[PDB]
């Protein structure tokens, strides 16, 4: 019952340059319970070999985790992070915005 909705940030490790290999990050924070499912997407399709960091929690007790995968940003492909957590009745999908 003590639930906290996760905050989600989707961003690249290095400045985005269409055509050049990079790493896409999905930083999920401020959530509780610790149980959480994260999937990274490319044009609505799950990206294979997505790496999950080990989970941790911050000074305010809320948990956080970092999911990341290799990707090559383009002109037309879309990238997003879909998070399923008990605090939400439905999975939340956040798209990558290269200006954020």
């Amino acid at each position: 019952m003590i639930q906290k909705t996760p905050q989600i940030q989707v961003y690249s490790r290095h400045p985005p340059e269409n055509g050049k290999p990079n790493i896409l990050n999905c930083y999920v924070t401020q959530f509780h319970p610790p149980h959480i499912e994260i999937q990274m997407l490319k044009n609505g399709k799950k990206i294979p070999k997505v790496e999950m960091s080990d989970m941790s929690f911050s000074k305010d007790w809320s948990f956080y985790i970092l999911a990341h995968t290799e990707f090559t940003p383009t002109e037309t492909d879309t990238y997003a992070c879909r998070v399923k957590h008990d605090s939400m009745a439905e999975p939340k999908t956040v798209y990558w915005d290269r200006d954020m």
Partner: protein, 273 residues
């Protein structure tokens, strides 16, 4: 400002005897060790290069202690279930943060010990390392139980002893890593926002440590309450990122300046579109 902390988490697994237990140690906010109950072979593991200095007996000792913590958290979670009249059919969490801080003079500055149930403050050891602060009625039970047993002295001893001992050692072994900086690489971007207005983003990338301050100014004044500041995020390679943006009238961008303050920067940066 130096410190060491162990963030422990125990999550009950309905129907099972053993809860999942995860312990992560930090020195100056850098993860350096970790023990996870789920691993194929549970053992504290090195998470910082400088920890490769420790011999096999170190990991062996830490691992045993972890086993001890598993049992403590297991029993405590069962007790808490009773305190709150909760059902075992559901999952619950018990967390603990403990450690010490060193001041500029190097002496111990303060010791810490705090617990949280279901992610909410439960009970905490006060700075005097003698009295307890309970968050609710349930915790009051624990408080009275611990005063009568004199648990405080146990924690105080570790916090003023072993905790300080190993923090000095760790700060000494990973000195070259922990005391380094990677000043931020910054730049400003320009983006469309709405009619007659645009967004200016001040980016700070690849910096370490995470501590940083970004500000915007308009004709000599910092735009405190009219600035969107994102929460600091990990780049994934050990460094961090952060940015602050402001919405400005199209045509007056040149009137705004961004300042970046980081300890790797002897003088604050000053950028603009």
């Amino acid at each position: 400002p130096h410190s060491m902390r162990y963030f422990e988490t125990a999550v009950s697994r309905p129907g099972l005897e053993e809860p999942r237990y995860i312990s992560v140690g930090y020195v100056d906010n850098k993860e350096f060790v970790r023990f996870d109950s789920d691993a194929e072979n549970p053992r504290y593991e090195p998470r910082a290069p400088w920890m490769e200095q420790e011999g096999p007996e170190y990991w062996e000792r830490e691992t045993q202690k972890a086993k001890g913590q598993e049992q403590w958290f297991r029993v405590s979670l069962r007790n808490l279930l009773g305190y709150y009249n909760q059902s075992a059919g559901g999952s619950h969490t018990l967390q603990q943060m403990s450690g010490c801080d060193l001041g500029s003079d190097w002496r111990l500055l303060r010791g810490y010990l705090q617990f949280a149930y279901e992610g909410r403050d439960y009970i905490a050891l006060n700075e005097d390392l003698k009295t307890w602060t309970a968050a609710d009625m349930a915790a009051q039970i624990t408080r009275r139980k611990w005063e009568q047993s004199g648990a405080a002295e146990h924690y105080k001893a570790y916090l003023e002893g072993e905790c300080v001992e190993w923090l000095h050692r760790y700060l000494k072994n990973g000195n070259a890593t922990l005391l380094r900086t990677d000043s931020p690489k910054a730049h400003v971007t320009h983006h469309p926002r709405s009619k007659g207005e645009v967004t200016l983003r001040c980016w700070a990338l690849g910096f370490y440590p995470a501590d940083i301050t970004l500000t915007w100014q308009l004709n000599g004044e910092e735009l405190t309450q009219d600035m969107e500041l994102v929460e600091t995020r990990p780049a994934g390679d050990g460094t961090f990122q952060k940015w602050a943006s402001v919405v400005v009238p199209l045509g007056k961008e040149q009137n705004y300046t961004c300042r970046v303050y980081h300890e790797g920067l002897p003088e604050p940066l000053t950028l603009r579109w």
